Scaffold this motif. Structure first.
Motif, short mmCIF file in Angstrom:
data_model
loop_
_atom_site.label_atom_id
_atom_site.label_comp_id
_atom_site.label_asym_id
_atom_site.label_seq_id
_atom_site.Cartn_x
_atom_site.Cartn_y
_atom_site.Cartn_z
N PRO A 46 0.81 -1.22 0.00
CA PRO A 46 0.00 0.00 0.00
C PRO A 46 0.85 1.27 0.00
CG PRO A 46 -0.20 -1.30 2.07
CD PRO A 46 1.06 -1.69 1.37
N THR A 47 0.94 1.93 -1.15
CA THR A 47 1.69 3.18 -1.23
C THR A 47 1.09 4.21 -0.28
OG1 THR A 47 2.25 2.72 -3.54
CG2 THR A 47 2.54 4.98 -2.76
N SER A 48 1.93 4.81 0.55
CA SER A 48 1.46 5.70 1.61
C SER A 48 2.50 6.78 1.86
CB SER A 48 1.15 4.89 2.88
OG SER A 48 0.81 5.74 3.96
N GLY A 49 2.28 7.55 2.93
CA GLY A 49 3.25 8.52 3.41
C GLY A 49 3.63 8.22 4.85
N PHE A 50 3.18 7.07 5.34
CA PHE A 50 3.44 6.65 6.71
C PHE A 50 4.94 6.60 6.98
CE2 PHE A 50 1.85 3.46 10.14
CZ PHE A 50 1.87 4.48 11.07
N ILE A 51 5.31 6.94 8.22
CA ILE A 51 6.72 6.90 8.60
C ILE A 51 7.17 5.47 8.87
CG2 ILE A 51 6.16 7.39 11.02
CD1 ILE A 51 8.77 8.98 11.16
N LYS A 52 6.26 4.60 9.31
CA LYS A 52 6.61 3.19 9.48
C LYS A 52 6.90 2.52 8.14
CE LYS A 52 4.58 1.78 13.89
NZ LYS A 52 3.64 0.83 14.56
N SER A 53 6.36 3.04 7.04
CA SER A 53 6.63 2.46 5.73
C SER A 53 8.02 2.81 5.21
CB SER A 53 5.58 2.91 4.72
OG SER A 53 5.69 4.30 4.46
N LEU A 54 8.75 3.68 5.91
CA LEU A 54 10.13 3.98 5.54
C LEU A 54 11.10 2.86 5.92
CD1 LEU A 54 10.41 7.75 6.59
CD2 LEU A 54 10.03 6.82 4.30
N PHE A 55 10.63 1.84 6.63
CA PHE A 55 11.49 0.79 7.17
C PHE A 55 11.04 -0.56 6.61
CE2 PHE A 55 13.46 3.55 10.40
CZ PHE A 55 12.55 4.59 10.41
N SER A 56 11.74 -1.62 7.03
CA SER A 56 11.48 -2.96 6.52
C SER A 56 10.29 -3.60 7.23
CB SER A 56 12.71 -3.85 6.67
OG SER A 56 12.87 -4.27 8.02
N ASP A 57 10.28 -4.93 7.28
CA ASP A 57 9.23 -5.68 7.96
C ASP A 57 9.54 -5.92 9.43
OD1 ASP A 57 7.86 -6.20 5.36
OD2 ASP A 57 9.65 -7.44 5.02
N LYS A 58 10.82 -5.98 9.79
CA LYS A 58 11.24 -6.30 11.15
C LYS A 58 11.17 -5.05 12.02
CE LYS A 58 14.76 -8.86 11.75
NZ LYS A 58 16.15 -9.41 11.71
N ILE A 59 9.93 -4.65 12.31
CA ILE A 59 9.64 -3.52 13.19
C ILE A 59 8.88 -4.06 14.40
CG2 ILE A 59 8.25 -1.45 13.48
CD1 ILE A 59 8.81 -0.87 10.48
N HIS A 60 9.44 -3.86 15.58
CA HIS A 60 8.75 -4.15 16.84
C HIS A 60 8.66 -2.86 17.63
CE1 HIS A 60 8.05 -6.13 20.87
NE2 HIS A 60 7.17 -6.75 20.10
N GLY A 61 7.87 -1.93 17.12
CA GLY A 61 7.73 -0.63 17.74
C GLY A 61 6.30 -0.14 17.66
N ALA A 62 5.91 0.62 18.67
CA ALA A 62 4.58 1.21 18.76
C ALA A 62 4.73 2.70 19.02
CB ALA A 62 3.74 0.56 19.87
N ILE A 63 4.42 3.51 18.01
CA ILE A 63 4.40 4.96 18.17
C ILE A 63 3.04 5.34 18.75
CG2 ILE A 63 4.82 7.16 17.05
CD1 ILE A 63 6.12 5.58 14.76
N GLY A 64 3.05 5.95 19.93
CA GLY A 64 1.82 6.30 20.61
C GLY A 64 0.96 7.33 19.90
N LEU A 65 -0.11 6.87 19.26
CA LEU A 65 -1.08 7.75 18.61
C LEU A 65 -2.34 7.80 19.47
CD1 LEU A 65 -1.70 7.69 14.77
CD2 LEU A 65 -3.32 8.65 16.38
N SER A 66 -2.92 8.99 19.59
CA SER A 66 -4.09 9.18 20.44
C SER A 66 -4.94 10.32 19.90
CB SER A 66 -3.68 9.46 21.89
OG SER A 66 -4.82 9.75 22.68
N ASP A 67 -6.24 10.07 19.76
CA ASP A 67 -7.19 11.09 19.37
C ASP A 67 -7.76 11.74 20.63
OD1 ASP A 67 -7.11 8.75 17.43
OD2 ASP A 67 -8.05 10.27 16.15
N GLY A 68 -7.54 13.04 20.78
CA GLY A 68 -8.02 13.76 21.94
C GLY A 68 -9.17 14.70 21.64
#
Length: 250
Positions: A46-68
């Protein structure tokens, strides 16, 4: 440099007002900075602008997103230039549509914030740096990448027009030539109110995505410091990017 308490408050939290989004920007998305206050969307296959898509598949990270707020009283010519710049794509006309307006008040109410955890974003960038794509690494070194870390959305946005001449409408909707969004008049009481229908996005917080002096992928200017519990994150905010007031005569 705007002096309205509404905008001054926005620059304190690193937000910059957004023109009418042809794109409808999203949090945690990358945008390349070209000229002045202009940005260009970065597409990552899925072509996107996500920052997680700048990396490979071996990602074990959670960027804290929250709708306030509202602006001070502005002259109609100032309010005309505001909407001229805000809807610069379709080129609307507002010149003498505000002739009966002695002062205008912008009202931005029902605010919902999409705030990504900036602290989590840095640590996420540091741990997963070894999985960064090499093709995107060389471009990240140019220093023009910015990460949208927070969004300002408004459910209700309306404009109040004070009548120079009572009995006549503060805003003459006839002379509104090419408005991209739908607007209708509010119920009366001494002054005219103009409301715009919303599902929008009016503010973004852009932090630069850069390599520090020791070469660590981060958004914090104090990355390479020794870590202390009281440490504040010094972000590279686009509101801090100084702009020489070059004027252009076509």
């Amino acid at each position: 440099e705007c002096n309205d308490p509404f905008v001054v408050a926005l620059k304190d939290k690193g937000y910059s007002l957004v023109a009418y989004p042809k794109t409808s920007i999203r949090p945690l998305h990358i945008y390349e900075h070209t000229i002045k206050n202009a940005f260009k969307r970065i597409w990552i296959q899925p072509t996107s602008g996500f920052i997680k898509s700048l990396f490979s598949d071996k990602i074990h990270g959670a960027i804290g997103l929250s709708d306030g707020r509202k602006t001070n009283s502005l002259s109609s010519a100032v309010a005309a230039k505001i909407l001229e710049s805000y809807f610069q794509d379709s080129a609307p006309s507002f010149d003498l549509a505000f002739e009966n307006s002695s002062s205008v008040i912008f009202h931005i109410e029902e605010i919902i914030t999409t705030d990504a955890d900036e602290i989590s974003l840095r640590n996420w960038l540091n741990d997963n740096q070894n999985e960064l794509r090499e093709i995107y690494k060389e471009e990240i070194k140019k220093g023009n990448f910015f990460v949208a870390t927070s969004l300002l959305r408004a459910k209700k946005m309306r404009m109040q027009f004070e009548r120079k001449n009572k009995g006549e409408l503060g805003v003459d909707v006839s002379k509104i030539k090419n408005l991209p969004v739908d607007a209708k008049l509010e119920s009366k009481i001494t002054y005219d109110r103009l409301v715009f229908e919303t599902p929008i996005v009016f503010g973004v917080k852009l932090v630069r995505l850069f390599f520090s002096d020791n070469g660590i992928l981060t958004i914090d200017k104090k990355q390479d410091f020794n870590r202390v519990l009281g440490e504040n994150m010094a972000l590279n905010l686009f509101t801090e990017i100084q702009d020489a007031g070059f004027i252009e005569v076509t």
